[PDB]
Symmetry: C3
Subunit: 148 residues, 3 copies
């Protein structure tokens, strides 16, 4: 009877993090809505909120890239946006003047925490570079919430 959601990246969405519950082993029950790529809370309460993203690259080309993942809360019904959880990662410290190269790298980021939410609040799980995501398979990219 608890509101719950476990949504995954839609692998047909090219260059975007599009969440989807249309998968076996994914959930969107008891009031939680997926609207505008956001999770809308059905009741006020304490919620465990979490998400994982997986980035992938092929070597460290010429310069440098920071990868971010954040879960924001947008309170009320069109109020402000505020970050609840956030992480940053840098895949390449270096890779310069020729030689050999071109080795793929993978980098997972996990975020998870317990928060007091009000009915109607909207949650967003967002990354800066959707073009570096890897949802080539599995339980590699996901976002969920469960009322506690």
């Amino acid at each position: 009877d608890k509101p719950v959601a476990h949504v995954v990246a839609n692998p047909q969405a090219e260059g975007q993090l599009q969440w989807s519950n249309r998968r076996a082993n994914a959930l969107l029950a008891n009031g939680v809505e997926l609207r505008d790529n956001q999770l809308v809370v059905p009741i006020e309460g304490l919620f465990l909120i979490y998400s994982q993203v997986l980035f992938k690259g092929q070597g460290c080309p010429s310069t440098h890239v920071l990868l971010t993942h954040t879960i924001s809360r947008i309170a009320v019904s069109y109020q402000t946006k505020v970050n609840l959880l956030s992480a940053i990662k840098s895949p390449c410290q270096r890779e310069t003047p020729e030689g050999a190269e071109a080795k793929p790298w993978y980098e997972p980021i996990y975020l998870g925490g317990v928060f007091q939410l009000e009915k109607g609040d909207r949650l967003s799980a967002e990354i800066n570079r959707p073009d570096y995501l890897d949802f080539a398979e599995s339980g590699q990219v996901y976002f969920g919430i469960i009322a506690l």
Copy 2:
């Protein structure tokens, strides 16, 4: 009264990820069974499932290595296996022709999510290279589940 399990790597198992509840601060209660290195669910319901693995290496020898960690579900009572959560990590982008070397590196991977399971389902937390694991101590390698 909720089914629950928090098992750790058995440090006496050389080159294998062998789960064990025989530790203070580990749990295996209310129906959850550890059978064939797998966690068997006692009732249908929503479960928070999670696991951490820690890999360790001593420099980046000649070529390259990918480290994987996945939690699969094997539904029913001898049905198919399917991945619920998965992560990949690459420890070495490089390390070639002589010089100095040989610095140990550590890499943790965390997986966690909420899933609807049926009684009898079996859960596996698996890695590709058990020879790179580090459970030299602590709460470094663990796998748990708790009915929500």
Copy 3:
């Protein structure tokens, strides 16, 4: 009615990991106490415990550094300390004799698990180098617990 806490790093504490509940989107309710920078459990029970730390550096200066994060339990009322969850990470495999340099790097560590605690137990989330932390913003550094 469940004991719960979600505390964040206090950004005014220079070179120390000082936890604080004095933030919107932070919690310290139903009996959980923040005493001596530790979370004191109000009742015996199963608790989901978790924490994230984010380290940041500016290149890989001359030698090497290991970053640790651990959550310990200190049972009873002045008994022993024991690690429940722990992770290690090494930011620099290399960076030697001149050239160019000086690129900032970020490294997040996440810990989370379910544990049977007794009333009065104290929990500590600790790092080895508080001088490498980054709580420059957001939900970057946090420690929470919720009775299950």
